[PDB]
Amino acid sequence: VLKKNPLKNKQVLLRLNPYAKVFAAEKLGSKKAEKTGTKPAAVFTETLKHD
Amino acid sequence: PSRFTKTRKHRGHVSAGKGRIGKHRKHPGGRGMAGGQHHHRINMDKYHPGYFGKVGMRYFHKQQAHFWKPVLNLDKLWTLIPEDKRDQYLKSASKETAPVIDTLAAGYGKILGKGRIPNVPVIVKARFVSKLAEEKIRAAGGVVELIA
Amino acid sequence: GIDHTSKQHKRSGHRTAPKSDNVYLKLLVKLYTFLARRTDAPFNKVVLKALFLSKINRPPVSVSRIARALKQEGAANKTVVVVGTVTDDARIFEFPKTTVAALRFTAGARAKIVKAGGECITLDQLAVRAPKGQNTLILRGPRNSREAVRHFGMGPHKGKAPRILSTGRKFERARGRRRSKGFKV
Amino acid sequence: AKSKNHTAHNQTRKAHRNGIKKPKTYKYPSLKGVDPKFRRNHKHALHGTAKALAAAKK
Amino acid sequence: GKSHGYRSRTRYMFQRDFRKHGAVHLSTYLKVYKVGDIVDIKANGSIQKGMPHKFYQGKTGVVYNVTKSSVGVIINKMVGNRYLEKRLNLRVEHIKHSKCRQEFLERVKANAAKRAEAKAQGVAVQLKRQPAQPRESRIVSTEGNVPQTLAPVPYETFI
Amino acid sequence: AISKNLPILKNHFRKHWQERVKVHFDQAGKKVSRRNARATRAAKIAPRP
RNA sequence: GAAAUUGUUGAAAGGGAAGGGCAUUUGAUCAGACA
RNA sequence: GGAAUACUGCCAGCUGGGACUGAGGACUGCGACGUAAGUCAAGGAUGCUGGCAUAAUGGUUAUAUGCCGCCCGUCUUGAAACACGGACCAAGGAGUCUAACGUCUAUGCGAGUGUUUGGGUGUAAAACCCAUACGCGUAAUGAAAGUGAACGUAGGUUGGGGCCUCGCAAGAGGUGCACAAUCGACCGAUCCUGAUGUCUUCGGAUGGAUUUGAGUAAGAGCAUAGCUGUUGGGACCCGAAAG
RNA sequence: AAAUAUGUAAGAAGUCCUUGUUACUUAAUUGAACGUGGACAUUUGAAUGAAGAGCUUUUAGUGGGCCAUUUUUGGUAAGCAGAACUGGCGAUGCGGGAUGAACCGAACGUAGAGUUAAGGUGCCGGAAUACACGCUCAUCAGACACCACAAAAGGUGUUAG
RNA sequence: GCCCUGAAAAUGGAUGGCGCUCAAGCGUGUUACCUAUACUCUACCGUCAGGGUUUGAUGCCCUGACGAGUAGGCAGG
RNA sequence: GUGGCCUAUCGAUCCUUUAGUCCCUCGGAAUUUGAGGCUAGAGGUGCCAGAAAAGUUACCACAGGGAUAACUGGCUUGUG
Ligand SMILES: CN[C@@H]1[C@@H](O)[C@@H](O[C@@H]2[C@@H](O)[C@H](O[C@H]3O[C@H]([C@@H](C)O)[C@@H](O)[C@H](O)[C@H]3N)[C@@H](N)C[C@H]2N)OC[C@]1(C)O
Ligand SMILES: CN[C@@H]1[C@@H](O)[C@@H](O[C@@H]2[C@@H](O)[C@H](O[C@H]3O[C@H]([C@@H](C)O)[C@@H](O)[C@H](O)[C@H]3N)[C@@H](N)C[C@H]2N)OC[C@]1(C)O
Ligand SMILES: [Mg+2]
Ligand SMILES: [Mg+2]
Ligand SMILES: [Mg+2]
Ligand SMILES: [Mg+2]
Ligand SMILES: [Mg+2]
Ligand SMILES: [Mg+2]
Ligand SMILES: [Mg+2]
Ligand SMILES: [Mg+2]
Ligand SMILES: [Mg+2]
Ligand SMILES: [Mg+2]
Ligand SMILES: [Mg+2]
Ligand SMILES: [Mg+2]
Ligand SMILES: [Mg+2]
Ligand SMILES: [Mg+2]
Ligand SMILES: [Mg+2]
Ligand SMILES: [Mg+2]
Ligand SMILES: [Mg+2]
Ligand SMILES: [Mg+2]
Ligand SMILES: [Mg+2]
Ligand SMILES: [Mg+2]
Ligand SMILES: [Mg+2]
Ligand SMILES: [Mg+2]
Ligand SMILES: [Mg+2]
Ligand SMILES: [Mg+2]
Ligand SMILES: [Mg+2]
Ligand SMILES: [Mg+2]
Ligand SMILES: [Mg+2]
Ligand SMILES: [Mg+2]
Ligand SMILES: [Mg+2]
Ligand SMILES: [Mg+2]
Ligand SMILES: [Mg+2]
Ligand SMILES: [Mg+2]
Ligand SMILES: [Mg+2]
Ligand SMILES: [Mg+2]
Ligand SMILES: [Mg+2]
Ligand SMILES: [Mg+2]
Ligand SMILES: [Mg+2]
Ligand SMILES: [Mg+2]
Ligand SMILES: [Mg+2]
Ligand SMILES: [Mg+2]
Ligand SMILES: [Mg+2]
Ligand SMILES: [Mg+2]
Ligand SMILES: [Mg+2]
Ligand SMILES: [Mg+2]
Ligand SMILES: [Mg+2]
Ligand SMILES: [Mg+2]
Ligand SMILES: [Mg+2]
Ligand SMILES: [Mg+2]
Ligand SMILES: [Mg+2]
Ligand SMILES: [Mg+2]
Ligand SMILES: [Mg+2]
Ligand SMILES: [Mg+2]
Ligand SMILES: [Mg+2]
Ligand SMILES: [Mg+2]
Ligand SMILES: [Mg+2]
Ligand SMILES: [Mg+2]
Ligand SMILES: [Mg+2]
Ligand SMILES: [Mg+2]
Ligand SMILES: [Mg+2]
Ligand SMILES: [Mg+2]
Ligand SMILES: [Mg+2]
Ligand SMILES: [Mg+2]
Ligand SMILES: [Mg+2]
Ligand SMILES: [Mg+2]
Ligand SMILES: [Mg+2]
Ligand SMILES: [Mg+2]
Ligand SMILES: [Mg+2]
Ligand SMILES: [Mg+2]
Ligand SMILES: [Mg+2]
Ligand SMILES: [Mg+2]
Ligand SMILES: [Mg+2]
Ligand SMILES: [Mg+2]
Ligand SMILES: [Mg+2]
Ligand SMILES: [Mg+2]
Ligand SMILES: [Mg+2]
Ligand SMILES: [Mg+2]
Ligand SMILES: [Mg+2]
Ligand SMILES: [Mg+2]
Ligand SMILES: [Mg+2]
Ligand SMILES: [Mg+2]
Ligand SMILES: [Mg+2]
Ligand SMILES: [Mg+2]
Ligand SMILES: [Mg+2]
Ligand SMILES: [Mg+2]
Ligand SMILES: [Mg+2]
Ligand SMILES: [Mg+2]
Ligand SMILES: [Mg+2]
Ligand SMILES: [Mg+2]
Ligand SMILES: [Mg+2]
Ligand SMILES: [Mg+2]
Ligand SMILES: [Mg+2]
Ligand SMILES: [Mg+2]
Ligand SMILES: [Mg+2]
Helix, strand or coil, rough: CCCCCCCCCCCHHHCCCCCCHHHHHHHHCCCCCCCCCCCCCCCHHHHHHCC | CHHHHHHHHHHCCCCCCCCCCCCCCCCCCCCCCCCCCCCCCCHHCCCCCCEEECCCCCCCCCCCCCCEEEECEECCCHHHHCCHHHHHHHCCCCCCCEEEEEEHCCCCEEEEEECCCCCCCCCECCCCCCCCHEEEEEEEEEEEEEEE | CCCCCCCCEEEEEEECCCCCCCCCCCCHHHHHHHHHHHCCCCHHHHHHHHCCCCHCCCCCEEEEHHHHCCCCCCCCCCHHHHHHEEEEEEECCCCCEEEEEEECCCCCHHHHHHCCCCCEEEEHHHHCCCCCCEEEEEEECCCCCCCCCCCCCCCCCCCCCCCCCCCCCCCCCCCCEECCCCCCC | CCCCCCCCCCHHHHHHHHHHCCCCCCCCCCCCCCCCHHHHHHHHHHHHHHHHHHCCCC | CCCCCCCCCCCCCCCCCCCCCCCCCCCCHHHCCCCCCCECCCCCCCCCCCCCCCCCCCCCCEEEEEEEEEEEEEEEEEECEEEEEEEEEECCCCEEEECCHHHHHHHHHHHHHHHHHHCCCCCCCCCCEEEECCCCCCCCCCCCCCCCCCCCCCCCCCC | CCCCCCEEEEEECCHHHHHCCCCCCHHHHHHHHHHHHHHHHHHHCCCCC
16 A cells, blocks of 8 residues: 555565575675786787877 | 437537537528539439439329239248147148138238248138249149139 | 557446346346356356347347257257347247247247247346356347348448338439449449 | 648548558458459359268268 | 649659660560469559559559459558558569568478477477677787777868 | 438428418317217117117 | 615725735634534 | 775665655554564554643635736637627526437337227226227339249358367367358349240240349347437527518 | 658468369360368567457538648748648647747646756846856947848957967 | 947837846856756546445445547536 | 550530330220330530529619728838
């Protein structure tokens, strides 16, 4: 009789999508990423900065 | 009754459903059949193909008496016998006794052929018949007596 | 505002109930509306509708058509159902037995069905014996047999018969009906 | 008094009310206009094969 | 006075196709039209008899009749808010088989194949048709092709 | 005055037809009166039938 | 013993018409509710 | 070389202030927190307190103030119009009735159906009853003389609702009315064919035909009524110059 | 020889095997047309949309139109005359264009709160006499589509080329 | 490019008005803001529809969508 | 090969008149004249879907029209 929104009102955000419990509990919104050091070919930075 | 009628409903709308532009006037066409041959030809042709002029022979002082010739098919013919007497003649198909049906008595002038009368013979007294009627009668064993 | 794909506030244009004020008729509705909803049986929903139809859509089913209907394969032992009135046909000499559920019966049809050992059932009796309408036969009368549908669509070269009072020669047989006068239709 | 003469204005809109209904196809179309010689045989050509599905159940 | 005669306005429509005038090559008379074929209707001005009316030029239809010189075609002509069925008697000079259906049949034959060829292989078909699909991911190589940078050009007159 | 698809009628009121209209409002009044005129003979007539 | 229309009493308002809509203040005047 | 930060985006991250709304009214659903028993913000507001209990809220009304508002009716592409009617009020003041009809719908009966010319009868224009006729249907097609509806389970084929059979079901087969499309058949008109026969000119069998009909092919009518529509009538109301 | 517009096709009424009927047709049981029987399945044959689709009767008003962008005829033109497609006005209020039938916006059951459109935010007037780089000084400055006009031609005014 | 000159009409008058000159003018950029009978959410009205339900059953109940209108038609009053 | 290479070269009902079968009716019955019918063409409507039609009103009339002329005003601005 009244549409309640997920995205606020946790109860129904938790009615659908119980993986909600997991996400919030494990963060994942804020999940870090794997730092890698790979560098671009010196062809790129030539044609990027080029005229 | 007046109380059911749309003209009560039109009280208070100016034209009375008659229209504000083309109004409702006396005789915009002409009266009655006027101009069948001119403006009204599109209605008169179709809707009444055949209206104008003449076709064949006149008749002076015709009398539909002489033409009285009511028609009765062998579709029925058995209706001229009341239903007690009828089933009685139905069973026991024979000559030497067969029902006498006087059709000119029953209001008729001719016997047509519509179809399928039982194998049961009948003597049909009549004024005129079709050749196909009188055949089927003879295929049930019956005959035809011309009368007046 | 709304770009409207179809006409708004569209009456569904299907008779919701009979236009008739007959109490008994209404009760047959009351019966079959119950049957229709709960029974899940198709035969019921049909008869509900056909209880609404006007005189025009209830053409008289002639007793002989019932004869012929039963001569269908395996169809002798079904019970013929007519929503409408049923009529006596002189033009059959033989008639079968069976059972005819019908809203009305003319004098003769009743006499002709019983005399051959059959049965004239009112429709609620048909509901009692046949709730899901099993082993039933429905027969519609000829609709376009009517004399009005003679004149429908009257046009050049439709051969549709005109609306006219007196008939014969002299009567809409001359111009345009024969190549000898004007054209032909 | 001189008046307007012709236009097709609005004439489209009025058709698309009832919408330009499509041609009305049927299976088994009419033989009207077919070569009369071809029909007079086609008649006797069906007449035979009807009598030949009549002895098939016999 | 205004004019509409049967052939009005057809000047350039019925015109004979540059360097293509003159009598008509015989393959036209050779082709065989069976009732129910899909025909294209194009007039040929050299052939005045059995000639379609200017409306039906460009039209495509199907043949209901087959007579000596001519296939009778039905076309659905729109008039008012409906279409009426119309029946045209055309000499085969004015007709040609339509290749609209060409891919269809070829696909029909193609479809029955891919059916029995995949089915006799253990199914997994997907034989319907698809619209052009957005491009896939791709790598492009700068090796031997370095991007050549471009600039809009200044105005010049040269007349 | 011609329209639709309607049988051509012929309805002949072109004269002052409202000058000749017989309603029989006496349909009862006469049926009485000619009964009473039958009684008056059957008595005035002696056993004659 | 209605209306147009008019006298007197009472009230009110009125800077080149009057009348209307929304809304509140103010004056007047009233129903309901509760108990 | 190592960071920072901007910029763009993401979070089922946490949180303050303000506004409007509280429809519904036992329970029933999806869930949520809990070891648990229980609890909840989970299918729509309840808890706490105060004031008043009266013109206080509110209604109505006049008025002032802010903003807005041009005379209605009409014909017209366009009307507040320098277009026409209208100073004011009351009371009158205009699509009716009738004959004949179309479509629809209700009802009575149904291959028939219509008591109400008239008669019988009456508690006397009512109600109640009824003999023969008639009208309209049930046969059509022809200008007419005149002929006059089954090859066949009243046909073949395609789709058909419903019903029947099989199957748990999914599905498959059977029968198939109304209706729709098509190919046939039958009656009359038209054109040809012209047997047996005989006043030697009558007779028209049998077989046909891109021809035709407001036809047949197990009837749908007739009568009352109502709306709307038609025509004739003073015919929605008022209006000529005339004759 | 375009663009825009335009005809048909995208299947069960389909595809394939087998072989019946005839008075048509072939030299020919050849072919034509309709067929009995048999096989082929689902993702029944591109997209998108669909509450639906098909069908019948009857009848009202109307049968002076006008306007806008684009195409376009006559005319020096015209708020003139006349065609093409579409959208409108007429029949329609509401917000903007001060004002205004047709422009812009957006179409109308009674209310509340929010947010916007077109247009606006010195004051009249709700909303920054906001920020930012320039140009412009007029002894007739200029100031917002439809829109209520201006031209050829000149300036050692100033600006940037 | 802006400005000046070219640029004459009759009641007194109109960038809508006042007025504005590193504008309140012209060209351009960025924000913020104001407010339609439109858009979103909720209440109520009506209409259409799809369900449910034997005691106002012509009833009750659930659910969704819609609402401009002259000439005109139908409907409930 | 179903008139002119294709795109134009034409005409209702009433009436008269011919062609056709020698067919149908003149209704108390016949024969013979005469009359009517069907099928098909011609005689023509050019305002070409098709009336039978002269003027004047400085003596005038009615219904209406700003659907329309004579004048002010408005657009235009060739012409001035
Ligand atoms: C009750 N009758 C009315 C009454 O309503 C009232 O009228 C005012 C009127 O004066 C107001 O006042 C206005 O009208 C007056 C009037 C003389 O025209 C003008 O002089 C004045 O400029 C104007 N502001 C006006 N805005 C509204 C009415 N209710 O004033 C008396 C009266 C005119 O007789
Ligand atoms: C709509 N109102 C108008 C009013 O604007 C004016 O009409 C103008 C008229 O002045 C113009 O016409 C006039 O003025 C213009 C200039 C001002 O454009 C000159 O070019 C033209 O030569 C001149 N005749 C004309 N082009 C359009 C009408 N709407 O004058 C008449 C009027 C009815 O008051
Ligand atoms: Mg009027
Ligand atoms: Mg009306
Ligand atoms: Mg009219
Ligand atoms: Mg004429
Ligand atoms: Mg017609
Ligand atoms: Mg006549
Ligand atoms: Mg007869
Ligand atoms: Mg006699
Ligand atoms: Mg709306
Ligand atoms: Mg609407
Ligand atoms: Mg004129
Ligand atoms: Mg004009
Ligand atoms: Mg016109
Ligand atoms: Mg003209
Ligand atoms: Mg020309
Ligand atoms: Mg070409
Ligand atoms: Mg030729
Ligand atoms: Mg007397
Ligand atoms: Mg008074
Ligand atoms: Mg004064
Ligand atoms: Mg005023
Ligand atoms: Mg005064
Ligand atoms: Mg006020
Ligand atoms: Mg950020
Ligand atoms: Mg509540
Ligand atoms: Mg508390
Ligand atoms: Mg207080
Ligand atoms: Mg108060
Ligand atoms: Mg107030
Ligand atoms: Mg007031
Ligand atoms: Mg105002
Ligand atoms: Mg007027
Ligand atoms: Mg005017
Ligand atoms: Mg007005
Ligand atoms: Mg004016
Ligand atoms: Mg006027
Ligand atoms: Mg006037
Ligand atoms: Mg006036
Ligand atoms: Mg008056
Ligand atoms: Mg006056
Ligand atoms: Mg009778
Ligand atoms: Mg079938
Ligand atoms: Mg189905
Ligand atoms: Mg002979
Ligand atoms: Mg009058
Ligand atoms: Mg009348
Ligand atoms: Mg008079
Ligand atoms: Mg007089
Ligand atoms: Mg006279
Ligand atoms: Mg398919
Ligand atoms: Mg098959
Ligand atoms: Mg006009
Ligand atoms: Mg008019
Ligand atoms: Mg104008
Ligand atoms: Mg104009
Ligand atoms: Mg114009
Ligand atoms: Mg108008
Ligand atoms: Mg309006
Ligand atoms: Mg609008
Ligand atoms: Mg406004
Ligand atoms: Mg405005
Ligand atoms: Mg609102
Ligand atoms: Mg708001
Ligand atoms: Mg001001
Ligand atoms: Mg402000
Ligand atoms: Mg500043
Ligand atoms: Mg600045
Ligand atoms: Mg302006
Ligand atoms: Mg200047
Ligand atoms: Mg100024
Ligand atoms: Mg400003
Ligand atoms: Mg600026
Ligand atoms: Mg800011
Ligand atoms: Mg409902
Ligand atoms: Mg329901
Ligand atoms: Mg409405
Ligand atoms: Mg109205
Ligand atoms: Mg030849
Ligand atoms: Mg020829
Ligand atoms: Mg030659
Ligand atoms: Mg002629
Ligand atoms: Mg005689
Ligand atoms: Mg004689
Ligand atoms: Mg004429
Ligand atoms: Mg003409
Ligand atoms: Mg005279
Ligand atoms: Mg004089
Ligand atoms: Mg003088
Ligand atoms: Mg004199
Ligand atoms: Mg004028
Ligand atoms: Mg002038
Ligand atoms: Mg000039
Ligand atoms: Mg000028």
